[PDB]
Amino acid sequence: MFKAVLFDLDGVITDTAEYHFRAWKALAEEIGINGVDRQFNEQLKGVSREDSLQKILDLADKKVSAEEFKELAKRKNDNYVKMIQDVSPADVYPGILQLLKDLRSNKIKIALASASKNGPFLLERMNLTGYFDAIADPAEVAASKPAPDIFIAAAHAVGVAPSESIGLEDSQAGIQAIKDSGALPIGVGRPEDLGDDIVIVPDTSHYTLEFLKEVWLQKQK
Amino acid sequence: MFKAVLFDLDGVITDTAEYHFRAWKALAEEIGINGVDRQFNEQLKGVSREDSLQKILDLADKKVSAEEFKELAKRKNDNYVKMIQDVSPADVYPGILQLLKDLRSNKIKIALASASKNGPFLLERMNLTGYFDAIADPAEVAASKPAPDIFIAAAHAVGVAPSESIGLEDSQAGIQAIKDSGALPIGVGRPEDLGDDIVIVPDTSHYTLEFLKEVWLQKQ
Ligand SMILES: O=P(O)(O)OC[C@H]1O[C@H](O)[C@H](O)[C@@H](O)[C@@H]1O
Ligand SMILES: O=P(O)(O)OC[C@H]1O[C@H](O)[C@H](O)[C@@H](O)[C@@H]1O
Ligand SMILES: [Mg+2]
Ligand SMILES: [Mg+2]
Ligand SMILES: [Mg+2]
Numbered sequence: 078m079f080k081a082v083l084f085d086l087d088g089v090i091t092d093t094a095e096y097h098f099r100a101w102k103a104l105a106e107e108i109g110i111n112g113v114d115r116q117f118n119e120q121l122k123g124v125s126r127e128d129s130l131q132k133i134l135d136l137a138d139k140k141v142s143a144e145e146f147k148e149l150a151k152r153k154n155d156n157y158v159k160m161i162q163d164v165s166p167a168d169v170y171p172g173i174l175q176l177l178k179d180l181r182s183n184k185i186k187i188a189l190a191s192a193s194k195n196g197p198f199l200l201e202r203m204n205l206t207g208y209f210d211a212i213a214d215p216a217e218v219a220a221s222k223p224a225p226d227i228f229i230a231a232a233h234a235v236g237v238a239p240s241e242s243i244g245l246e247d248s249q250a251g252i253q254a255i256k257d258s259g260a261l262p263i264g265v266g267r268p269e270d271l272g273d274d275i276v277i278v279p280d281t282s283h284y285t286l287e288f289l290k291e292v293w294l295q296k297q298k
Numbered sequence: 299m300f301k302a303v304l305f306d307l308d309g310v311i312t313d314t315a316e317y318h319f320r321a322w323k324a325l326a327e328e329i330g331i332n333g334v335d336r337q338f339n340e341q342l343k344g345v346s347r348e349d350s351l352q353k354i355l356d357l358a359d360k361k362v363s364a365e366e367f368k369e370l371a372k373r374k375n376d377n378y379v380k381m382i383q384d385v386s387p388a389d390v391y392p393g394i395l396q397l398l399k400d401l402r403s404n405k406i407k408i409a410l411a412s413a414s415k416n417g418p419f420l421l422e423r424m425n426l427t428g429y430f431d432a433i434a435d436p437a438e439v440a441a442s443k444p445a446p447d448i449f450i451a452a453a454h455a456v457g458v459a460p461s462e463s464i465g466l467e468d469s470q471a472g473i474q475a476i477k478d479s480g481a482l483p484i485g486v487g488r489p490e491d492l493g494d495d496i497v498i499v500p501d502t503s504h505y506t507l508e509f510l511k512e513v514w515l516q517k518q
């Protein structure tokens with residue numbers, strides 16, 4: 078049986094992938110870059126703050142000083158943080174709270190593997206901090222998803238090897254990071270977007286301890 | 299949220315489907331019928347006593363007098379009743395007791411929809427009688443499963459509409475009966491036998507209050 082579950086936050090626990098998209102959209106248009114639409118946002122999901130800006134910059138081949146780069150990243154975050162002030166326990170996606178309770182009840186470790194530095198604020202505002210045995214600190218992990226670093230760190234932070242872990246993700250980059258880490262990905266979204274080679278659920282209500290066990294087992298074979 | 303759970307008994311609450319199968323198998327061979335194997339028994343699960351006997355006879359194209367037909371049904375039952383004298387709380391399938399507690403804790407009606415006239419005796423030997431708000435009396439409904447009559451009666455006996463009820467069943471006929479009642483079936487057994495069109499769990503430990511809730515919420 079798997080010994081840990083590594084949670085993405087934005088788009089898995091709550092509807093904050095939407096707000097990241099809005100805020101990034103707003104930053105691009107401000108600096109004159111027009112192609113950050115929903116289809117392009119699929120490449121930004123799971124991607125770290127600085128790396129997300131660089132994708133946006135590359136879209137227009139725009140080049141900026143190191144100082145302006147830092148300033149744009151701060152401006153997007155100041156905006157995003159203003160967007161997420163209403164988040165509360167009411168915004169926790171379906172299945173998630175029960176899943177955390179069941180994981181804690183069955184002594185399965187729970188770790189956050191969110192690239193977001195706003196992760197801890199959101200878990201507290203959603204009154205979920207108590208469920209998390211560990212949070213991987215994006216300030217500590219060298220490389221943004223699709224690099225596995227964050228999922229490796231989360232597994233280790235709860236004393237578990239990635240091969241004994243499930244990762245829950247809504248993004249292409251995060252799913253690749255799970256695979257490359259050795260953990261077992263279970264995606265939430267459209268198969269069109271996240272790939273029909275892995276187990277994809279239409280929404281988080283499908284994420285249940287028993288569903289995770291079925292997946293796991295079927296994997297073992 | 300669903301307002302009642304209509305329990306089958308044999309093969310759901312306890313392992314008595316096996317006892318019925320043994321008994322029917324031993325009776326068939328006595329009148330010379332050798333083909334009552336596990337695969338054929340899937341056609342007997344959920345079926346009333348007299349109908350199960352008629353199926354066994356039809357398997358061999360055998361005809362008997364009305365007197366012998368009664369006599370054979372009584373013979374099987376006398377043997378079945380002997381077999382079940384040892385049943386106790388130790389024989390309740392896993393998960394079943396906790397489920398009943400959680401349903402009664404959540405004020406969800408619990409009704410028996412067992413075609414077995416031995417149903418109340420088994421509930422008492424398993425010390426489960428207290429949990430049941432009502433028991434549908436199979437003597438009062440003529441039509442055996444797969445007809446929905448028994449499940450209709452069980453739901454009505456606890457004041458709940460079948461469409462607001464979940465039925466738990468181990469048999470092909472009962473799952474058909476639940477379906478035609480309008481209730482939501484969740485089977486326990488092999489999907490090969492009960493159909494991969496409905497939610498099927500491998501054993502009763504999967505029957506938990508929250509699983510019933512997730513399944514029901516997953517409506518349409
Ligand atoms: O800007 P931060 O709050 O540190 O978030 C950095 C990244 O983490 C999240 O998990 C999202 O999937 C990304 O859209 C976001 O850019
Ligand atoms: O003979 P009875 O105890 O009246 O049982 C009548 C029927 O009820 C049970 O639920 C079983 O599924 C059937 O195998 C049995 O034939
Ligand atoms: Mg995400
Ligand atoms: Mg300068
Ligand atoms: Mg049965």
Ligand SMILES: [Mg+2]
Nearest residue numbers: 428429430431
């Ligand atoms: Mg009572």
